[PDB]
């Protein structure tokens, strides 16, 4: 039930990343690759209006479940390269949209609506440098337990207390999973 919808939303996102308009073929794909990789600007755009025309229920689903679609757009979407060599080097992606004709008033953007969309409008106040505090990761040993896609997220530690050989934490330790982490770049304004 949830599996089929999670697959089909990703499918209807991926197939639409290539436009039917703007001529045809794979010359445009090469041009976009040249415009992206060569300067490493990481700037892409897709018309949300056409996406809504194709499936308006998609715009409602993303609107009500940004908190649910962010982690799948993070991992599964990266399949556009079709090259196994470039997938491990890549850490994060960048996409955007310009001249959006749909917006909501901030006065109607009440705090009671967490998980919807909002427009970044206002005054820049209180700039902050980037600090690399611990965000997400894991230290679990592979000889003891296998990796599940449910751990940490925020600063909290492991809840389960099974196989208490390394679980005993009454001793300082600095083993940081620098190989497996969500650390790219981040700041608050």
């Amino acid at each position: 039930v949830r599996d089929e919808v999670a697959e089909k939303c990703q499918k209807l996102f991926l197939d639409f990343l290539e436009e039917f308009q703007s001529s045809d073929g794979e010359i445009k794909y090469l041009q976009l690759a040249e415009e992206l990789i060569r300067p490493e600007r990481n700037t892409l755009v897709v018309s949300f209006v056409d996406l809504e025309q194709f499936n308006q229920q998609l715009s409602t689903t993303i609107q009500e479940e940004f908190y649910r679609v962010y982690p799948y757009l993070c991992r599964a979407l990266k399949t556009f390269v079709k090259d196994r060599k470039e997938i491990p080097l890549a850490k994060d992606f960048y996409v955007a949209f310009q001249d959006l004709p749909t917006r909501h008033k901030i006065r109607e953007l009440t705090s009671s609506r967490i998980g919807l969309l909002t427009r970044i409008s206002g005054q820049v106040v209180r700039t902050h440098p980037v600090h690399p505090e611990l965000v997400s990761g894991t230290f679990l040993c592979l000889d003891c337990q296998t990796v599940i896609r449910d751990v940490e997220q925020q600063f909290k530690y492991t809840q389960p207390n099974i196989c208490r050989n390394p679980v005993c934490a009454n001793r300082r330790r600095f083993l940081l999973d620098t190989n497996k982490s969500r650390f790219v770049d981040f700041q608050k304004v």
């Binding site: 080097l89 440098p129 980037v130 600090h131 690399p132 611990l134 940081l176 620098t178 650390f183 770049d185």
Partner: protein, 235 residues
């Protein structure tokens, strides 16, 4: 989390400076050189010496730095300061211890271009005959075979005459504008600030060190603070 190849120059040593903090010391390192394309301000490197390369590093070594940038931010206890945008702890792993040039060189010896060369030296404003002499001497910059050049101008700041020195950076390789008080980081002058319980006192690295056997340009010299004058007078 990738091995990175880069270059850098050791600027200073911290033998002259005075237990968790004692394990390491602080050094000021830059990577971007002076260039027209480098006009946008880059992210400065701050390297940490973990008592391994101390006293073994000497100024003037055009060396290459290679390593991996792990973001093992030791400040998780929130009792110190932090690194700029390139938020990562930088470890040191490589310090050495011990063409169009040719085509132009062929034209350099040529006397046909050697005649009009001193009749095109100052095309921007054509200035005054004395200024060109000072500029030409500055361009060449010439055991104890040393020397200093004091070029003086007599105008006013409102006219671009004050900004005439801005055009030198197009030709000069190392030009930094001080503007007087509140220059970029260290403006060749040493200063002391009050520090919290656990932070490192600052070893002031001027552009004087960064242009060893080079050329350093100073603007608005007489607008500096009276306090800075006392320290800089001796050096």
């Amino acid at each position: 989390n990738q091995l990175i190849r880069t270059s850098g120059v050791v600027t200073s040593c911290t033998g002259v400076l005075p237990t968790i903090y004692q394990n390491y010391q602080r050094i000021r390192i830059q990577e971007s050189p002076g260039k027209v394309a480098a006009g946008r301000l880059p992210r400065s490197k701050d390297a940490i010496l973990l008592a391994d390369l101390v006293d073994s590093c000497k100024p003037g070594d055009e060396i290459e730095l290679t390593g991996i940038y792990h973001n093992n931010y030791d400040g998780s206890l929130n009792t110190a300061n932090g690194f700029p945008v390139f938020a990562t702890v930088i470890l040191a792993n490589h310090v050495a211890k011990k063409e169009d040039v040719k085509m132009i060189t062929s034209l350099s010896k040529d006397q046909q271009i050697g005649e009009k060369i001193f009749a095109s030296i100052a095309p921007s404003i054509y200035g005054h005959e004395d200024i060109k002499r000072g500029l030409a001497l500055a361009l060449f910059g010439g055991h104890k075979v040393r020397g200093d050049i004091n070029v003086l101008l007599c105008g006013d700041p409102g006219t671009a005459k004050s900004q005439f020195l801005k055009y030198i950076e197009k030709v000069s390789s190392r030009a930094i504008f001080t503007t007087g008080q509140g220059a970029s980081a260290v403006g060749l002058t040493a200063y002391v600030q009050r520090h919290p319980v656990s932070r490192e006192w600052t070893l002031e690295a001027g552009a004087l060190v960064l242009a060893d056997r080079g050329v350093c340009l100073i603007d608005e010299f007489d607008k500096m603070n009276d306090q800075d004058r006392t320290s800089i007078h001796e050096a």
